Amino acid sequence: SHKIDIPDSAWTIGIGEKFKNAGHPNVKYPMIDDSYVQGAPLGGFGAGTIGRTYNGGFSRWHLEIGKNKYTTVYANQFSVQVLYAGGYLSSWKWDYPKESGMYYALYPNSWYTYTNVQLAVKQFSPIIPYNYKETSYPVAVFKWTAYSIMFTWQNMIGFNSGNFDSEIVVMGNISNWNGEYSIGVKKVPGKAKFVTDGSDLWEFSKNDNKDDEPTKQGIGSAIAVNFKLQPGQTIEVPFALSWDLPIMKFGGGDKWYKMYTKYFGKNGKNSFAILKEALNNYQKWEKMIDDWQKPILSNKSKPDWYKTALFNELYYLADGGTAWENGKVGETNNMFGLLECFDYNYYETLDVRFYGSFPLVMLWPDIEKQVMRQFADTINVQDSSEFKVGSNGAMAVKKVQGMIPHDLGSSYALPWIKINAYDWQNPNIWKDLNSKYVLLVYRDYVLTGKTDKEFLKYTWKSVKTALDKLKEMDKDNDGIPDNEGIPDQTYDTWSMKGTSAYCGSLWLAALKAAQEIGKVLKDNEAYIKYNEWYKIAQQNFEKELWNGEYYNFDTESDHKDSIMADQLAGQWYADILRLGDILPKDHVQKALKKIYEFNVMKFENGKMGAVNGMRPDGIVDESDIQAQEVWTGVTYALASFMKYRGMTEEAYNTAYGVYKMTYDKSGKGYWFRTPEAWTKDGNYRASMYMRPLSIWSMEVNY
Amino acid sequence: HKIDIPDSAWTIGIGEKFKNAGHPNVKYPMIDDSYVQGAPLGGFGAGTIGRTYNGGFSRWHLEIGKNKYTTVYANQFSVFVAQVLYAGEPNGYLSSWKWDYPKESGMYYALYPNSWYTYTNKDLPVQLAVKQFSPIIPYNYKETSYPVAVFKWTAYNVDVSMFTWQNMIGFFVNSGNFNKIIKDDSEIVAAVMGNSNDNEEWNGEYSIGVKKVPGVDISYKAKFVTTGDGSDLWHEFDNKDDETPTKQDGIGSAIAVNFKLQPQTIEVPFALSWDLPIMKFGGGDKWYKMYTKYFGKNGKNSFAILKEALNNYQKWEKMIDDWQKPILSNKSKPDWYKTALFNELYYLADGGTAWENGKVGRTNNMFGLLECFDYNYYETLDVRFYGSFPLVMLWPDIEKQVMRQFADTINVQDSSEFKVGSNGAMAVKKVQGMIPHDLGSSYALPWIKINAYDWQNPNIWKDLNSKYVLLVYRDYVLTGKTDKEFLKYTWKSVKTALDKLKEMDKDNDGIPDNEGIPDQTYDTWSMKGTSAYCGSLWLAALKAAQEIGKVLKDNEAYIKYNEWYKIAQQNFEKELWNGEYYNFDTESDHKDSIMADQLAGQWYADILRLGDILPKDHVQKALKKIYEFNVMKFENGKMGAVNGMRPDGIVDESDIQAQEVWTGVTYALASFMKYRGMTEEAYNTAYGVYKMTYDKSGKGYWFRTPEAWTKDGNYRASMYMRPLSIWSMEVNY
Ligand SMILES: [Ca+2]
Ligand SMILES: [Ca+2]
């Protein structure tokens, strides 16, 4: 009751609190909306994860990789009266009282405090920067603190028929979807088979002791802690949950072992081995967590809201249907993938990770460079089977040689094997992907010391190919690839034509970045070529687009003089990659002030982020729905650029609107499901999105 | 629930206890009114009333210059179950009323000048929330002086019902007191608790009241015994009049509203006024308060005032909100900083503030803020050097008036001797050429008898004459470099000030000589030889005087001060710069102490755009050294910057001053860190002062931020002017 840790910057909500302003999808096609009843997830990378919500319920199951089932498995609780703020199991005391406890989260930690004796728990999994071991585990620790505490848990094998010093006291299947869940507890100085009516386990209500050791049609266990509290006294018991579900399968066939198998084995009967390791070591884990968080949490110049966003946004690295493979079932690297989101069910969407992958480069760089090499490998893959383009019904080659793919597949097909699952447009003619690929490769070198010349060696052929193919898309001999007057980049319904601010700046930065790689690898043929291309392109970019107050959207559209939030995407990266000024400081500082004055300040009073497109007359551009959207990950990326350029006030005001909408009492209730986009009414599109992880680009220090 | 309380409001629950509150750390007498305080009500120079977080009107600064902490229990708001909204019990009197408003049932919120109460009890199904304030407004020298306090209530099928207020007349005991009842494109009903028709300190009238608003109906008792069991009023929750003079029994009024509310939100403003137009000081002088300029001097205008408020209050909320917006809308700045920035301004009204509009039982209106109550001294120059930032920045016409008062006193010679407290010796009261230590005490004669302070002899201080010159130029600079008149008026004082300090350079190194005896604000800590502190202050003052000399075309002076500066700067660097910091001084035992204030001259040189008196690289390293030592090695950086740290990382133990954190000095240090790109260090440094003052884990000095604390967190001199220096963090470049 205020003895526990609980940092100031933790996101807080009353247990059982209703939220009367939650936004909904602003599109009519199929889209997830699990509502506002969410919490920080539990799970390592690749392990599948479990959303325990602020109401108590274990409600949001990503255990099946790449998929999202939202249902409260009501048998899973901690009971004192049951701690859940809300048919079967009728004998339990449900509707836990309101104005009677709180939830706090600062990912990877969260906490509950119950104050109707008074209790508090700290739940977390060992998500720790620069640690590729514990971070993989399918484990959660629940460190209770009292100043009768029972963990019940359903047998979720088949989510039925066929299911069974140190001091610590396992559900499964008769076969040898198969695996085990184990709960448990540890002895500090102080049942077995339920029917999921529930009077069987609920007595209990004063304070069975039965140890059964199989069914055919609602099994489930329970594990209690009994003690008397001498007044003034405060004890503490560590609980835990594990899940050995070692195989993931994807709609198309392939079955794979999860990453935690490397440490606990592929067998699927190692749940207790995992959960024990948890209960004997969580002390050392808390510490490792605190130690990485301290530098930011103690820098009292930064507002508490920005800490809240920064840390909790990390929920998605584990929660984005994340796949980390330790060999295929059947039979020297462990391939990795994060979903763009669950609605657009694509792994590693490259035009999005350009923004979204900052937490991996900065905090788990070995994973990052792995994913970049996966993209290196695909670049020359040719697949001439045709597909139907969703936007216009054109036929097109699936994968063209020398073109970076949009994605590396779908949980509904064959991740890592069948790439370009995306079909709304043809990514083989996108003008941003090949640029962005170069930029990511060089960023991943620069943000890891400038020492991994092996990484540059592996990717260098791909890099040179990527830009050689783009150069061929220059129709008008200006040295820049021409946008085709359809959406051929991440803004996949907003047409760009001729030369765009966006695709052009990325091409400038990509050419500069290849130049530097050129130097580092003693390759003067590529160095000279890219600098000659660079000088022609820069002169013309600048002539074509600079209008004296900002860079024009493009040279050839009817909306060519729209103010685009992301006009200087190239320069933003160039600052990060220490390539210096590909555009004049004066023009950049002018464009940034323009975007803040127009796209932020003239859109819902600067309280909702940066809308993508604004007309010179200060009215939102209506040429495309995307122009009328704030993209959370673009806004955050914009704030980082403003921060580096010394527009500090403007940076944080820009980024506050995203925080607010997401987390604040006056927002739209997107905590732990941050969407790609919202429109001016606050309604959203594509919750649980990769892009807004870009907030970590604000922590890039110089 | 349906009201815009800002995020940065300081907040505590009503009736909440505080376990780890600090107390005096000295053996001599010292005020300690405990942690139960809140934002004060009242304008500059009107007297102030501190309604605490528990609801009581309990800290009485209406006798200008004094602080009476006693709860006047008949002064309350009550909700009709029937309950007085005050988390406490009245010994005896007023016993029939419902006391002990319950714990864990309501919140106090403060972001000065506004403060809020929200009441949410099980047994009061109708929810209530009140926002109180007085119209403290920058660049306004009118409403900002009103002795007035609006209370904007807000409730949200039941019919909720009372503002009770004892006749305070004779509280600074009861004879001749009568309660009249006024009824007035608006409809207002008011009590007026008055008295006799003399121009004396104690006479005048209080007054409470309310504005109609459709849906609410106004009742009114008008002569409750306050020295009774209170049944006279408690029974009926009458509507009687009773203009009948009381004699030995203390009387009191009571306004109310009845309203009917359906499953709707009602907004009813009540309000308080007080016309005590005359302030008497201890040595006899009697003055009119500033608000008398706008409402008159006779002491019977309490209703007029109260009317102006209830008619114009919404206009005042917009004025306040308009001035707070640029800071609140800035989301780069943390909330705690905003909480400190605004609530520290409480002190401009709370600090014995005195602002005159004629002697009883004249083109100008003299002004004066107390150093604090314990050391009862108006405008202590050392302290205003740090603490006057909110005045130059938000109320610059007051600021210039105060500096004209100093310019007119530098020539004063009072050859009489007085006994020096610290050592018994006799010294001249006031030497001509030397700026005075202060402009008097409220126990004597403010503005008329200066240098009331006597613990040391300030006529040999080596810092105040420089500080004065720096203040003058600051005031010119922070008001747009346009006010040549001000400089013309103060120019002779400046040249005298500097010329007098120069005569104390007895070793001919260009810098005035600290003498080992008390001769600057760190009096017991002691300096000798050339000091970083007095020395840096001197270099910047010369630098300032050159600029004024350019601006006013005094070439003879510009040349002279330039000459002195060049010679002084060189020796300052030779004598004190060690490569990591500037040494404390050249001849003391503690000469290698790292002092938090070592570069005070350069801090003001930045604010004055005077350029580098010291090289950037040196300044940068000195500030690193101070953060790394004086902050980070003093209670792990969570309590401010300790004044003195030895080279080996141990606090300088030579004097109690070296082991204190001075709050005003720490905030100034943070601003200086902030100016020079040490943003993290700056806010980490200022943060510890906020923790101590405002946070669950501090020592509970909200609305009484002290001069200092030691490592245990206990304090010296609560209600201190110096922490207003936090506004120096808001200087724009
Ligand atoms: Ca072109
Ligand atoms: Ca000297």
DSSP secondary structure of B499-544: HHHHTT-TTSSSSPPEESSS-SSSTTT--EESBHHHHHHHHHHHHH
Which phi and psi angles does B529 have, rounded to 5°? 85, -135
Q: Which ligand is nearest to the CA of B502?
A: 2
Structure tokens at B311: 């008619």
Q: What are residue A52's DSSP bridge partners?
A: A58
- CA atoms of A23 and A346, how far apart (whole Å): 24
Q: Kindly give, in sequence order, each residue whose CB lies less than 8 Å from that of residue B321, ignoring residues fewer than 6 positions away.
A: none
Q: Could you tell me how far CA B195 lies from the centroid of its own chain?
A: 32
**Strands of the A323-328 sheet, one edge to the other:** A247-249, A255-258, A323-328, A336-337
Asked if the C-beta of A300 comes within 8 angstroms of chain B's C-beta atoms, the answer is yes
Provide, for chain A, the percentages of residues in helix, strand and coil under a 3-state DSSP scheme, each rounded to the nearest 5. Answer: 30, 15, 50
Torsion of CA B141, B147, B152, B158, to 10 degrees: -170
| CA quadruple B374, B375, B376, B380: dihedral sign | negative
Does B347 share its domain with B321? Answer: no
DSSP labels for A159-170? ---S-----B--
Element (H, E) at B390: helix B389-394
What's the burial of A650, exposed, middle or buried (CB within 10 Å: 0-12/13-18/19+)?
buried
Map A221-275 to HEC letters. EEECCCCCCCCCCCECCEEEEEEECCEEECCCCCEEEECCHHHHCCCCCCHHHHH
Amino acid present at B45: G
- CA atoms of B594 and B481, how far apart (whole Å): 35
Does A255 share its domain with A333? Answer: no
**3-state DSSP assignment of residue B152:** strand
- CA atoms of B168 and B172, how far apart (whole Å): 8
- CA atoms of A371 and A364, how far apart (whole Å): 11
- CA atoms of A535 and A546, how far apart (whole Å): 16
Shortest Cα distance, chain A CAs vs residue B683, angstroms: 5
Asked if the C-beta of B331 comes within 8 angstroms of chain A's C-beta atoms, the answer is yes
> CA of A254: how far to CAs of A322, A413, B311, B442, B647, in Å?
16, 8, 77, 88, 67
Q: Which residues surround ligand 2, an ion (CB under 5 A)?
A: B 505, 507, 509, 511, 513
Residues B334, A300: C-beta atoms closer than 8 Å: yes
- CA atoms of A620 and A631, how far apart (whole Å): 14
Long-range contacts of B521-524 (CB under 8 A, 24+ apart): B521/B382, B521/B461, B521/B463, B522/B597, B522/B643, B522/B657, B523/B422, B523/B455, B523/B456, B523/B657, B524/B655, B524/B656, B524/B657
Neighbour-count burial for B206-225, b at 16+ CB within 10 Å, e otherwise: bbbbbbbbeebebbbbbbbb
**3-state DSSP assignment of residue B717:** coil
**3-state DSSP assignment of residue A424:** coil
Does A327 share its domain with A228? Answer: no
- Of B543, B378, B554, give the one whose Cα is nearest residue B466: B543
Q: Could you tell me if residue B27 is left (phi over 0), alpha (psi between -120 and 50 degrees) or otherwise beta?
A: alpha
Amino acid present at B504: M
What resolution (Å)?
2.6
For residue B113, cis peptide bond before it (omega within 30 degrees of 0): yes
Count how many residues are written for chain A. Answer: 702
Structure tokens at A296: 């930011």
Partner residue facing A300 (CB), from B330, B331, B687: B687
Domain boundary (A230, A262, A297) is at A297
Q: How many structural domains compose chain B?
A: 2
| CA quadruple A326, A328, A333, A335: dihedral sign | negative
- Of B326, B22, B273, give the one whose Cα is nearest residue B151: B273
> CA of B365: how far to CAs of B138, B399, B439, B486, B636, in Å?
17, 12, 15, 16, 47
Neighbour-count burial for B572-607, b at 16+ CB within 10 Å, e otherwise: beebbbeeebbbbbbebebeebbbbbbbbbbbbbbb
Does A293 share its domain with A355? Answer: no
- Give Dmax over CA atoms of chain B in angstroms: 85
Residue with tokens 């597949």: A409
Does A471 share its domain with A334? Answer: yes
**Strands of the B708-709 sheet, one edge to the other:** B661-662, B708-709, B715-716
Shortest Cα distance, chain A CAs vs residue B295, angstroms: 41
| CA quadruple B324, B325, B326, B331: dihedral sign | positive
Does B287 share its domain with B356? Answer: no
Shortest Cα distance, chain A CAs vs residue B8, angstroms: 11
For A649, name the nearest residue in chain B, comparing CA atoms only. B332
Structure tokens at A649: 């006030």
- CA atoms of B115 and B199, how far apart (whole Å): 34
Check: CB of residue B291 under 8 Å from CB of residue B145: yes
Map B396-436 to HEC letters. HHHHHHHHHHHHCCCCCCEEEEEECCCCCCEEEEECCCCCC
Does A135 share its domain with A167? Answer: yes
- Of A285, A275, A312, give the one whose Cα is nearest residue A166: A275
> CA of B383: how far to CAs of B375, B471, B630, in Å?
12, 11, 21
Annotated binding site of A: 474, 476, 478, 480, 482
| CA quadruple B433, B437, B443, B445: dihedral sign | positive
End-to-end CA distance of chain B: 40
Check: CB of residue B584 under 8 Å from CB of residue B596: no
Q: What are residue A183's DSSP bridge partners?
A: A241
- CA atoms of B451 and B237, how far apart (whole Å): 55
Q: Kindly give, in sequence order, each residue whose CB lies less than 8 Å from that of residue B168, ignoring residues fewer than 6 positions away.
A: B62, B72, B193, B206, B274
Does A187 share its domain with A279? Answer: yes
For B695, name the nearest residue in chain A, comparing CA atoms only. A8
Shortest Cα distance, chain B CAs vs residue A556, angstroms: 38
Does A113 share its domain with A87? Answer: yes
Q: What angle (nearest 5°) sits at the alpha carbon of residue B284, between those of residues B279 and B290?
A: 25
Range of the domain at A100: 1-297
Check: CB of residue B341 under 8 Å from CB of residue B326: no
Residue with tokens 């990527």: A466
- CA atoms of A87 and A197, how far apart (whole Å): 8
Count helices and strands in chain A by DSSP H and E runs = 15, 27
Q: Kindly give, in sequence order, each residue whose CB lies less than 8 Å from that of residue B96, ignoring residues fewer than 6 positions away.
A: B229, B230, B231, B234, B235
Does A240 share its domain with A109? Answer: yes
Q: Could you tell me how far CA A672 lies from the centroid of its own chain?
A: 10
Q: What are residue A223's DSSP bridge partners?
A: A151
Domain boundary (B307, B328, B349) is at B328
Q: Which ligand is nearest to the CA of A533?
A: 1
What's the burial of B425, exposed, middle or buried (CB within 10 Å: 0-12/13-18/19+)?
exposed
Does A211 share its domain with A307? Answer: no
**CA A529 to ligand 1 center in whole angstroms:** 17
Chain B residues 663-692 within an 8 A CB cutoff of chain A: 679-680, 682-684, 687
User: Which chain A residues are Cβ-neighbours of B684 within 8 angstroms?
Assistant: 298-301
Map A455-475 to HEC letters. HHHHHHHHHHHHHHHHHCCCC
- Structure-determination approach: X-ray
Asked if the C-beta of A642 comes within 8 angstroms of chain B's C-beta atoms, the answer is no
Q: What are residue A13's DSSP bridge partners?
A: A103
Amino acid present at B18: F
Residues A653, B335: C-beta atoms closer than 8 Å: no
Structure tokens at B719: 């209600």
Q: What are residue B116's DSSP bridge partners?
A: B109, B131
DSSP state of B183: E
- Of B33, B29, B39, B34, give the one whose Cα is nearest residue B19: B34
Residue with tokens 């860079």: A551
- CA atoms of A164 and B524, how far apart (whole Å): 79
Structure tokens at B418: 């007085």
For A606, name the nearest residue in chain B, comparing CA atoms only. B329
Does A572 share its domain with A680? Answer: yes
> CA of B207: how far to CAs of B54, B168, B309, in Å?
22, 10, 12
- CA atoms of B631 and B666, how far apart (whole Å): 9
Long-range contacts of B441-444 (CB under 8 A, 24+ apart): B441/B65, B441/B282, B441/B376, B441/B377, B441/B378, B442/B64, B442/B65, B442/B66, B442/B281, B442/B282, B442/B352, B442/B354, B442/B370, B442/B376, B442/B378, B443/B65, B443/B281, B443/B282, B443/B283, B443/B376, B444/B281, B444/B282, B444/B283
Structure tokens at A359: 């937490």
Check: CB of residue A140 under 8 Å from CB of residue A151: no
DSSP state of A510: H
Check: CB of residue A585 under 8 Å from CB of residue A575: no
Amino acid present at B520: Q
Residues B331, A656: C-beta atoms closer than 8 Å: yes
**3-state DSSP assignment of residue B554:** coil
DSSP labels for A267-329? SS--HHHHHHHHHHHHHHHHHHHHHHHHHHHT-TTS-HHHHHHHHHTTHHHHHTT-EEEEEES
Amino acid present at A634: V
Q: What angle (nearest 5°) sits at the alpha carbon of residue A70, between those of residues A65 and A76?
A: 95
Structure tokens at A377: 């490998």
**Strands of the B83-84 sheet, one edge to the other:** B83-84, B76-79, B163-166, B251-255, B220-225
Check: CB of residue B153 under 8 Å from CB of residue B256: no
- CA atoms of A258 and A482, how far apart (whole Å): 43
Check: CB of residue A123 under 8 Å from CB of residue A140: yes
Asked if the C-beta of B330 comes within 8 angstroms of chain A's C-beta atoms, the answer is yes
Domain boundary (A297, A313, A340) is at A297
User: Which chain B residues are Cβ-neighbours of A302 within 8 angstroms?
Assistant: 334
- Of B491, B731, B493, B473, give the one whose Cα is nearest residue B608: B473
Q: Could you tell me if residue A417 is left (phi over 0), alpha (psi between -120 and 50 degrees) or otherwise beta?
A: alpha
| CA quadruple A480, A484, A489, A491: dihedral sign | positive
Structure tokens at A426: 């043809």
- CA atoms of B31 and B219, how far apart (whole Å): 41
User: Which chain B residues are Cβ-neighbours of A301 within 8 angstroms?
Assistant: 334, 679-680, 682-684
User: What is the CB neighbour count within 10 angstroms for residue A468?
Assistant: 13
Torsion of CA B282, B60, B686, B608, to 10 degrees: -50
> CA of B552: how far to CAs of A553, A614, B500, B549, in Å?
54, 51, 21, 5
- Of B96, B98, B94, give the one whose Cα is nearest residue B250: B94
**CA A555 to ligand 1 center in whole angstroms:** 10
- CA atoms of A527 and A519, how far apart (whole Å): 7
Map B263-314 to HEC letters. CCCECCEEEEEEECCEEECCCCCEEEECCHHHHCCCCCCHHHHHHHHHHHHH
Partner residue facing A301 (CB), from B329, B331, B682: B682
User: What is the CB neighbour count within 10 angstroms for residue A12?
Assistant: 16
Shortest Cα distance, chain A CAs vs residue B132, angstroms: 24
Residue with tokens 């006009």: A567
Check: CB of residue B56 under 8 Å from CB of residue B62: no
Torsion of CA A412, A416, A422, A426, to 10 degrees: -150
| CA quadruple B191, B196, B198, B202: dihedral sign | negative
Chain A residues 195-224 within an 8 A CB cutoff of chain B: none
Asked if the C-beta of B364 comes within 8 angstroms of chain A's C-beta atoms, the answer is no
- Of A545, A485, A539, give the one whose Cα is nearest residue A511: A539
Q: Could you tell me if residue B722 is left (phi over 0), alpha (psi between -120 and 50 degrees) or otherwise beta?
A: alpha
